[PDB]
Structure formats: C-alpha cells, structure tokens
C-alpha cells in the first residue's frame with residue numbers, strides 16, 4: 302500500500318518544462334535564457350533536473366496570457382497580479398502563467414522575467430510564501446547584479462528535495 306506523501310512535492314527528480322508561447326516584450330532567446338537561469342536557481346541547490354520540451358505535455362507548462370486564460374485565476378490587466386503557478390500535481394499542477402498585460406524585461410525596468418520566474422518556479426516545486434522580507438518567496442516583488450538565492454529559500458526547497466550534491 303501507499304498513503305499520500307506528507308507534503309506536496311514532485312515524486313521524481315527529472316522534471317520537464319515547456320514554453321508554450323512567448324511575450325511580445327522580449328526576444329525568444331531572452332525568454333529562454335531567463336527561464337533556464339530561473340530553473341538553475343533551484344537545480345543548483347537540490348537533486349532536481351529540468352529538461353526543456355519543445356512540444357507535447359511537460360510537467361511545468363509555461364505560458365503568457367491575459368484576463369481569462371483557462372483557470373480560476375484570471376489576470377487583471379496592467380499592474381496588480383503579475384503571475385501565478387500551481388503546486389506540484391497532475392494537469393495544471395506545476396504550471397506557471399505570466400500576465401502579458403505586464404511589461405516583462407531582462408533589466409530593472411518593468412518586471413524582471415528571470416526574477417518573477419524564479420519565484421513562480423518556487424511555487425511550481427512546492428514552496429508557498431515566506432515572511433522573510435529578503436526571501437525570493439516573499440509575497441511582494443522588489444528589484445542589483447549577481448543574483449544569490451537567500452538562505453530561507455535554500456532551507457525551504459531543501460526541506461522538500463534534499464540538497465543534492467552539496468559541492469557541485
């Protein structure tokens with residue numbers, strides 16, 4: 302027999318993602334680099350592996366949309382809600398949606414796509430919000446060079462998946 306696991310988490314270390322569509326605001330290359338870097342934030346401190354799929358069904362389906370886009374969490378035009386992601390599980394579980402009424406960037410202007418993606422993928426992997434105002438998983442977006450994952454987020458993600466190689 303098997304009872305349900307104690308916490309919501311992926312039951313496998315190999316996860317896939319798919320960039321289903323793209324924002325007008327950035328090049329395909331810029332978007333791909335931002336998401337790759339965002340996944341690496343989490344794979345660096347766990348035993349998780351992320352593989353990109355070009356088509357078909359991936360664990361983490363990524364998309365840009367506006368207003369009603371196929372779930373119970375419609376976006377709201379410019380400002381307000383920015384993005385959301387579902388916790389680990391089947392179907393919409395793990396998926397990450399970005400409001401394409403926001404301005405997405407690879408700079409300090411608008412919303413930095415890498416930074417928001419890194420936060421969203423935290424939710425995709427099973428982290429809820431943190432009370433630490435310096436944490437990646439803090440509820441409110443603020444945005445320097447060279448990103449470093451704060452310790453609160455490292456402890457959180459490692460409570461779910463372990464550290465993987467502690468010196469890779």
Ligand SMILES: COc1cccc(CNC(=O)c2nc3sccc3c(=O)[nH]2)c1
Pocket residue numbers: 383384416417418420421435436437438439440441442443444448449450451
């Ligand atoms: C959609 O809600 C979101 C989206 C993204 C981030 C957040 C909250 N986290 C931050 O804003 C943040 N974390 C870190 S971790 C190292 C630097 C920084 C930084 O410059 N900002 C909330």
Ligand SMILES: [Ca+2]
Pocket residue numbers: 376377378379380381382383400402403
């Ligand atoms: Ca919005």
Ligand SMILES: [Ca+2]
Pocket residue numbers: 359360361362390391392393394395396
């Ligand atoms: Ca999914």
Ligand code: NA
Pocket residue numbers: 324325326400401402403404405
């Ligand atoms: Na946009």
Ligand SMILES: [Zn+2]
Pocket residue numbers: 370371372374375385398
């Ligand atoms: Zn959505």
Ligand SMILES: [Zn+2]
Pocket residue numbers: 420424430439440
């Ligand atoms: Zn959040």
